[PDB]
Write a protein that binds this ligand. Structure first.
Ligand code: ERY
Lengths: 1022, 150, 100, 50, 50
């Protein structure tokens, strides 16, 4: 084939024009987003029960729904929450590549049949299923400049003019409002009310008839009377449209000629829908808007188009609707992909910067410059063909293998222009003979590199795909090179070919090292060992090194989690958020751009006593010295905060990929397997918890991710009592309810939009137990009766967040392995510590520790097969149950050095280093196949032999193994190794190869020929 | 898909069903006609009844063998328990009560009712202290149901 | 209906939600004045209809709770749809033993 | 599907009451196994008979 | 405050037209290359496609 193509090279340009054309077409139509789909598809069902409590929410709703999540395919486990805010969250996680579009249907469809068993009041707010993809593209945030607008105001404008505006913008797959949207409040008053002999029920049943909207025919339309000239629609009752319009409501007419208005009993006033979240931005009222990708979209195109549609409206934005961007992914992805592409462009210059310095030529260097951006800037076509997307993972996926497709250009044009040079034919005729020596061992390395790579995207799941990206990009790049190295380049340097200060200074240094290579081969026992002692150093080094996923990186933002104690208050929470606010602003303004501070939602719960702080940093420019970065700022924050009294205020950095897992600890669920109560499970948990701290040999931080029980205010409605007075349980309940819980009456139209109408007492007459008194209820007689008449009141304990795993009461336990042991052993212990627990209590592993469990560690199993497809592949390239064994033992040499960036650098066993540690073996073994070919090659063709042929090999061979190894440790050692701008990965890519690409050459040249000698000879006894 | 469609046109008749027949719950499945296997549950101790062995199974094992992928249908060879109120029509007659009464009672006296909060969801001036107001909960024994007030 | 107070009351909601579904090409809608809505979603030539149907029905599940309870009692029907009748098999009674 | 039904049961047996035992009154899986796995014996035995 | 668009037959029709240039171009380009490969020359195809 390469011989056929050298003669017809006019065609081998066509072949390359396309690769390009198509490689380019892909580029100009590929998805760009930070990461791809890596978490298993999850479907969260979530509902509201206005003013409930975990128990109620649980046994009135969450249970029901769970008891119905059957007959749905591909479900892994079901997790559920019931807290004291009136809210339920049930999350069904689904097997790996279950189609999430059809997993949502199934869930949801099974819910629609349960709906009629939920309470009429949950059915109203509406239960709703979405696709759990906690991977935000960005979050805008409309703030008001002058102190004109409030939370609820800003909120309303946002979801009313710009909301749908964004919603329908080229590549936004979900928009999610960050606030209420005006709602008709009707803030009752037990006194203004008890005076007119009315209760809330009476208020309730007015908003209904006063605010309804009923039909009545047309005129003709439906069967008219013989001959008719007019048909037109009737318009009966409409819905109210104003605060004042609502205020004017008949509530009752007494003997007096006077009645009661709605205004008279309460406070009508437009306002917010729900009041427990306080979006505050750099001190000011905010009310943002979060936006998710779209699927096939472009985190950069739509990134822009958000900013475009956000203009246009800035004229229409009133007083000060100054839009801010307290979180955007767009910058990080750009100036990480404007890297990477940089590395190739450069590592290209490096192959032109070498090449010259090793071959005086210009038309020699100017062929890999027209061979690499073929493969590379064209393997993109294979990517794009397979649904893949330009992203952090697939991007580096190439950078990590740029060295393996460089060494495919150098290697050929070397043994073409130093096969003619070593006394021989013209250009055409040289390439013809010179290719015939490598022709085979490229097809050899091809299949041998399909192995040691393909057996990756066969891994676990959540991190299975994390890998697969790497695997497929590489094998695609790798295979495309071996092709251009058998079609284009070897029919190009045959029609292109033919620094001075040097040249002869190399021709001396070959013999200077071929000194001891040509020696030590009389008997090889020190070289046979030391190797046996490299195989160890590594085996002792492998273990030592700690494992991990993608390393935390300095993304634009980071977070601070405030958690006030037990009974705390949003206000008691604000004052703490206000210090956080402040510490960050005036005390760090050379790094901090903004704090978007939300209280009324945290991590462990959704309390009033909790908050979170999104602090988004200055541009990476204004953040120079390494102590102006995240790792540092959090340190300087987390401490400076460990001084607020009662208020755990921790600061932390986002993980690798937001919507994935986390720190190589465990996620552990304690289940209740007999009718054992909360107050029984809680003990079981506390046993284990305590029994777990007692073993700091492998523990760190075993803990409940839930919340401990709090005091609560029971109101025991005496039944007998209620009956004897003319007092109805339904009237009682509703007033206690609606006073304090609030209640969604119905809907009304305001400024052309539908909006809810809530009715609930002023906060003045609903703060303290000593406040109940106030509330009275009409009776049989028609007389106002106090709760004091028909209820008792006592304090007591009840969880404000009840939890369940797989429809069975759970409590979730988090914990790490403790500086020391392996992720695996922690789990292994925990399980034991769990066996001793009171009969009827079980455990399960979820999330990260479900992945680990059901995805063993296929590395040994898989690479067994690869390491066997290698020998099997390799052997038959040659002709031996023997010779391949000289190529294989080249593995260790690259493992070390790479592993020896456990020493000179303080890093871990990344997924990156896990995969750079493969691109190294790729070169390592490839040399081992070329040298070991050139040893069997001229030991058959010229017909040489023994220690002559093994020297004859590494002789004509060395220089390539130098040109390329140099080219790499240059193009792989720029800001890749020593950075500051989305570093992490860069460094993990680098040190992986770089050092370890050292020992994979400047240690393999003195070595591989040994490998061809101790083998072969040992297969000829007596 | 087929399932998706059936259920989607079913959904249009759902509001036209008797309240009672909703309350029971309609069901839509994609199952094979015939049983894959039958799973038996016995008590050797003689310590339980049919009565219990069913109810155990239902509360404790059915639910998940159900959500287990590939199981398009589960048949329960029995029933899980319920609070049973075997009325007596003479007894009812003496005290001058119908089943309607009995019912209205059970309804309002066996309830679970959101009574909001102390901390107020929006608050006042400046207030510490915030806790859940807990009204009625669901009776949970023969004993409790019995003590109802007719 | 009341036409304006049917759009805005149902259509603005259903429409709010058909935001961002794979291969959406153009959607067009109309209130009525007998209280009637036809949202239509037209997807990229070639796109899979049955999935389209599914997502359209998945986003409805979200609009749905936020619409008049009499509109809910009704239906809200989501289905794949053509525009032109393939045929119109009519039916007459010869010998007037049946009226229209 | 049987595979798992067996593992879901498994998972929940350590917590039954007194003398509560699973029993296998009927199953169409075991035959379907033995079936192919004896018709696979007809492959080996008949190659070791060529 | 008054814009426009095509739907139905129109949207399809328009989007047929806008497209054509792209069609003929990339199509010609494909024929050139197919000849280069085949008739050994980098510019006899330049001469066929005249
Ligand atoms: C062996 C033992 C089983 O018998 C069968 O498998 C036969 C062979 C089915 O027909 C087989 C074969 C066949 C062709 O039916 C004759 C096919 O239509 C069905 C789906 O499976 C029967 C009869 C089905 O009924 C049919 O259900 C149809 C939905 C409509 C039809 N009808 C009222 C008009 C009706 O007779 C159906 C659902 O299995 C009966 C339900 C009650 C069962 O699950 C019962 C317990 C069966 O598993 C079984 C008794 O254990």
């Amino acid at each position: 084939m390469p011989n056929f193509f050298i003669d017809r090279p006019i065609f081998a340009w066509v072949i390359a024009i396309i690769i390009m054309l198509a490689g380019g077409l892909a580029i100009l139509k590929l998805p760009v987003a930070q990461y791809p789909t890596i978490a298993p598809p999850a479907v969260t069902i979530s509902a509201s029960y206005p003013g409930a409590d975990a128990k109620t929410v649980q046994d009135t709703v969450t249970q029901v729904i769970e008891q119905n999540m059957n007959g749905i395919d591909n479900l892994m486990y079901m997790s559920s929450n019931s807290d004291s805010t009136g809210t339920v969250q049930i999350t069904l996680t689904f097997e790996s590549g279950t189609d999430a579009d059809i997993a949502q249907v199934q869930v949801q469809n099974k819910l629609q049949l349960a709906m009629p068993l939920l309470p009429q009041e949950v059915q109203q707010q509406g239960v709703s299923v979405e696709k759990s993809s906690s991977s935000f593209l960005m979050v805008v945030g409309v703030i008001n400049t002058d102190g004109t607008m409030t939370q609820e105001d800003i909120s309303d404008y946002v979801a009313a003019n710009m909301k749908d505006a964004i919603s329908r913008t080229s590549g936004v797959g979900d928009v999610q409002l960050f606030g209420s949207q005006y709602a008709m409040r009707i803030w009752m008053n037990p006194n203004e009310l008890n005076k007119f002999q009315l209760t809330p029920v009476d208020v309730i049943t007015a908003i209904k008839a006063q605010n309804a909207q009923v039909a009545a025919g047309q005129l003709g339309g439906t069967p008219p009377v013989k001959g008719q000239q007019l048909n037109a629609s009737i318009i009966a009752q409409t819905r109210l449209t104003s605060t004042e319009e609502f205020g004017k409501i008949l509530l009752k007419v007494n003997q007096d000629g006077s009645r009661v208005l709605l205004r008279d009993v309460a406070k009508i006033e437009l306002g917010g829908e729900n009041y427990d979240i306080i979006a505050e931005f750099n001190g000011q009222p905010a009310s943002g808007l979060g936006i998710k990708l779209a699927t096939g979209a472009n985190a950069l195109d739509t990134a822009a188009a958000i900013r475009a549609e956000l203009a246009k409206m800035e004229p229409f934005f009133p007083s000060g609707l100054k839009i801010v961007y307290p979180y955007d992914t767009t910058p990080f992805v750009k100036i990480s992909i404007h890297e990477v592409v940089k590395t190739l462009v450069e590592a290209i210059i490096l192959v032109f910067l070498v090449m010259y310095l090793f071959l005086q030529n210009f038309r020699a260097t100017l062929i890999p410059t027209i061979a690499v951006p073929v493969v590379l800037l064209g393997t993109f076509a294979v990517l794009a063909a397979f649904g893949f997307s330009i992203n952090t993972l697939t991007m580096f996926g190439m950078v990590l293998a740029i060295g393996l497709l460089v060494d495919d250009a150098i290697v050929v044009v070397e043994n073409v222009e130093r096969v003619m040079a070593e006394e021989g034919l013209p250009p055409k005729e040289a390439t013809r003979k010179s290719m015939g020596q490598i022709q085979g061992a490229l097809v050899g390395i091809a299949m041998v590199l399909s192995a040691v790579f393909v057996p990756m995207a066969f891994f676990g799941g959540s991190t299975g795909a994390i890998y697969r990206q790497f695997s497929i990009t590489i094998v695609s790049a790798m295979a495309l090179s071996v092709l251009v190295a058998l079609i284009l380049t070897p029919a190009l340097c045959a029609t292109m070919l033919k620094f001075g200060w040097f040249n002869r200074m190399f021709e001396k240094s070959t013999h200077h090292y071929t000194d001891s290579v040509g020696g030590i081969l009389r008997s090889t026992g020190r070289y046979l060992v030391l190797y046996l002692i490299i195989v160890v150093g590594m085996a002792y080094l492998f273990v030592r090194l700690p494992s991990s996923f993608l390393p935390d990186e300095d993304q634009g933002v980071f977070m601070t989690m405030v958690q006030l104690p037990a009974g705390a208050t949003q206000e008691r929470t604000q004052k703490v958020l206000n210090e956080v606010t402040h510490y960050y602003l005036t005390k760090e303004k050379n790094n901090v751009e903004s704090v978007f501070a939300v209280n009324g939602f945290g991590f462990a719960g959704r309390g009033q006593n909790t908050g979170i702080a999104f602090v988004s940093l200055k541009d990476w420019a204004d953040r120079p010295g390494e102590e102006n970065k995240v790792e540092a700022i959090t340190m300087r924050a987390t401490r400076a905060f460990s001084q607020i009294k009662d208020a755990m205020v921790f600061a932390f950095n986002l993980p690798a990929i937001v919507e994935l897992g986390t720190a190589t600890g465990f996620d552990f669920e304690l289940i209740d397997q007999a009718g054992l109560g909360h107050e029984k499970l809680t003990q079981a948990r506390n046993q284990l918890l305590a029994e777990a701290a007692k073993h700091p040999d492998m523990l760190t931080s075993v803990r409940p991710n839930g919340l401990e029980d709090t005091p609560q205010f029971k109101i025991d409605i005496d039944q007998e009592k209620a009956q004897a007075l003319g007092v109805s349980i339904n009237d009682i309940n509703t007033t206690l309810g609606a006073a304090w819980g609030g209640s969604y009456v119905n809907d009304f139209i305001d400024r052309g939009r539908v909006k809810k109408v809530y009715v609930m007492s002023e906060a003045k007459y609903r703060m303290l137990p000593d406040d109940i008194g106030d509330w009275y209820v009409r009776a049989a007689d028609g007389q106002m009766v106090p709760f004091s008449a028909f209820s008792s009141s006592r304090w007591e304990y009840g969880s404000p967040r009840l939890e369940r795993y797989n429809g069975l009461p759970s409590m979730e336990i988090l914990g790490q392995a403790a500086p020391g042991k392996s992720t695996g052993e922690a789990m292994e212990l925990m399980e034991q510590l769990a066996s001793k627990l009171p009969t009827g209590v079980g455990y399960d592993w979820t999330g990260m520790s479900y992945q680990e469990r059901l995805s063993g560690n296929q590395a040994p199993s898989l690479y067994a097969i690869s390491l066997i497809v290698v020998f099997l592949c390799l052997a038959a390239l040659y002709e031996s149950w023997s010779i391949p064994f000289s190529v294989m033992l080249v593995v260790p040499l690259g493992v070390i050095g790479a592993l020896l960036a456990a020493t000179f650098r303080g890093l871990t066993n990344d997924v990156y280093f896990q995969v750079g540690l493969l691109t190294t073996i790729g070169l390592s073994a490839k040399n081992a196949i070329l040298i070991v070919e050139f040893a069997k090659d001229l030991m058959d063709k010229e017909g040489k032999g023994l220690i002559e042929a093994t020297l004859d090999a590494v002789r004509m061979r060395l220089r390539p193994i130098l040109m390329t190894s140099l080219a790499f440790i240059l193009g792989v050692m720029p800001l890749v190794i020593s950075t500051g701008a989305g570093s992490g990965a860069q460094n993990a890519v680098g040190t992986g190869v770089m050092g370890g690409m050292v020992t994979a050459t400047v240690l393999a040249i003195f070595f591989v020929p040994v490998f061809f000698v101790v083998v072969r000879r040992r297969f000829s006894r007596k």
